[PDB]
Amino acid sequence: RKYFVAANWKCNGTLESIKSLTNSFNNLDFDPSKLDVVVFPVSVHYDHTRKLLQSKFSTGIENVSKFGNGSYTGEVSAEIAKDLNIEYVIIGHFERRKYFHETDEDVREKLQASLKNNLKAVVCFGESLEQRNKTIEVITKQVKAFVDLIDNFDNVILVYEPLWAGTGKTATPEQAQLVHKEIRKIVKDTCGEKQANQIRILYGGSVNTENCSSLIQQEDIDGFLVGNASLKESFVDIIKSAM
Amino acid sequence: RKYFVAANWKCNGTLESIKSLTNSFNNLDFDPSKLDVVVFPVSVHYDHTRKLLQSKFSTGIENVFGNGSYTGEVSAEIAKDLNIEYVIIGHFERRKYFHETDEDVREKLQASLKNNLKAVVCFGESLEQREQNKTIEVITKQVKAFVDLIDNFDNVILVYEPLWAITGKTATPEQAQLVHKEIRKIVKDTCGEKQANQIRILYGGSVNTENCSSLIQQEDIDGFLVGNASLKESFVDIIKSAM
Ligand code: NA
Ligand code: NA
Numbered sequence: 001r002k003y004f005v006a007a008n009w010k011c012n013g014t015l016e017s018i019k020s021l022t023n024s025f026n027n028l029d030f031d032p033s034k035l036d037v038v039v040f041p042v043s044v045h046y047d048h049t050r051k052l053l054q055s056k057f058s059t060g061i062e063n064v065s066k067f068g069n070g071s072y073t074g075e076v077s078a079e080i081a082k083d084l085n086i087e088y089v090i091i092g093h094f095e096r097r098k099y100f101h102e103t104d105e106d107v108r109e110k111l112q113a114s115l116k117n118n119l120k121a122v123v124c125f126g127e128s129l130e131q132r133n134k135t136i137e138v139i140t141k142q143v144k145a146f147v148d149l150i151d152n153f154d155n156v157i158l159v160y161e162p163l164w165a166g167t168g169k170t171a172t173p174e175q176a177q178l179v180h181k182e183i184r185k186i187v188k189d190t191c192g193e194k195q196a197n198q199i200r201i202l203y204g205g206s207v208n209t210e211n212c213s214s215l216i217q218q219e220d221i222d223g224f225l226v227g228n229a230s231l232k233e234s235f236v237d238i239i240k241s242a243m
Numbered sequence: 244r245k246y247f248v249a250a251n252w253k254c255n256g257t258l259e260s261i262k263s264l265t266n267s268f269n270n271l272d273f274d275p276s277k278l279d280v281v282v283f284p285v286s287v288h289y290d291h292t293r294k295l296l297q298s299k300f301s302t303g304i305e306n307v308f309g310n311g312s313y314t315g316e317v318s319a320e321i322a323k324d325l326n327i328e329y330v331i332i333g334h335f336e337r338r339k340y341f342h343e344t345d346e347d348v349r350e351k352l353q354a355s356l357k358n359n360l361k362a363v364v365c366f367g368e369s370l371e372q373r374e375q376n377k378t379i380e381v382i383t384k385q386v387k388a389f390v391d392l393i394d395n396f397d398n399v400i401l402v403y404e405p406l407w408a409i410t411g412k413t414a415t416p417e418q419a420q421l422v423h424k425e426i427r428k429i430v431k432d433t434c435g436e437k438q439a440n441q442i443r444i445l446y447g448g449s450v451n452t453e454n455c456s457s458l459i460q461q462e463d464i465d466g467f468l469v470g471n472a473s474l475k476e477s478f479v480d481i482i483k484s485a486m
Contacts, residue, residue, distance in 0.1 A: 063315030074306030
């Protein structure tokens with residue numbers, strides 16, 4: 001199973017900061033055929049980001065439209081992503097679910113549009129503080145909402161976002177692992193044992209240079225969707241933890 | 244004040260098609276100091292489209308929270324950083340498909356004007372609302388949600404979108420003219436006479452080569468936000484109508 005370290009820059013950065021950050025990223029020697037390394041910048045920063053990054057770094061977009069091409073203002077369709085050579089998209093990130101009101105129905109439709117247009121999909125999900133001893137219940141409902149559409153278990157990457165860890169609570173690798181194995185059990189029951197063992201499951205909580213080793217060494221944790229720490233040059237040490 | 248023919252490509256285009264399309268656009272010999280022409284590509288096509296278009300063409304993005312943890316969004320700060328001139332706010336598709344309110348429209352313009360972005364702000368009533376004689380009611384509520392934020396009345400552009408004629412019904416140039424005058428009346432009452440004669444009110448309904456002449460020559464119609472007709476080389480004829 002190939003490891004998958006993803007940087008989600010969210011709504012952050014300038015031309016100068018990307019030039020500085022991508023140059024620091026470039027300096028790390030790693031084998032792209034042994035380790036997947038993906039950076040997700042802002043839509044309007046994509047062209048700039050793709051130019052500055054070396055080809056060992058994969059790239060993608062932080063969202064994709066639930067519709068196709070046509071009269072859908074302010075949206076990026078999966079066709080346009082495929083035409084521009086965009087390899088990855090993120091779908092169902094907690095901030096889109098929370099602020100922009102993306103439902104499990106929208107995540108499914110976004111996944112269908114991505115896979116039909118030969119895009120790889122980083123699919124996010126996870127439970128709140130109040131919900132955590134209902135964790136398995138919630139994650140089962142979220143995974144099953146899209147999981148049957150997965151046509152290739154190398155091109156779809158699951159992300160566990162513990163929303164229970166802007167609350168004050170801190171998640172341990174042990175708590176991550178327990179959920180991770182249950183996510184893989186959900187894939188086993190729905191899509192089969194062979195396909196549950198193919199798929200990458202990322203940890204999309206608070207990841208930094210100190211906790212990534214203890215996390216990535218866990219059995220069912222296959223990489224990260226890293227937020228704030230990926231805006232630092234020290235993001236290379238999080239990539240190093242998966243080498 | 245100057246005419247203002249804008250191209251809203253919505254969620255359409257490819258690298259090659261835009262390459263062919265922007266070459267037709269550059270082929271038109273016009274005076275940018277006399278007439279503003281703006282192109283609103285998809286966020287990931289912006290860098291591509293800008294570099295293909297000559298300086299006489301202005302450019303913007305179709306949609307605009309500050310910098311932070313807002314996955315899949317483009318803030319006004321980032322838009323400023325990339326020297327993006329215009330943004331579209333409150334287009335009916337965003338109001339419809341993504342539940343954008345009069346509060347979001349107000350907050351986006353406040354953010355846009357704070358970062359020296361120019362804004363093409365859209366509004367309009369449905370068939371149900373026009374049936375109940377609420378055309379001026381609905382426009383007044385939508386306009387008065389944002390019009391007090393307008394500093395320079397060159398740098399904010401109003402777009403009347405007749406949602407009722409987007410349905411089966413077909414808006415005549417005389418019906419569009421009656422509404423455009425009331426919008427200017429609203430602006431004059433709230434902002435002043437000199438401000439109402441500065442501001443542009445664009446017809447954001449169905450515009451093509453068949454009807455552009457009859458709409459453009461109406462007294463209070465100051466240009467267009469053009470949809471599918473702006474995806475063709477014949478868009479130059481729609482620009483010619485405003486010259
Ligand atoms: Na592992
Ligand atoms: Na006129």
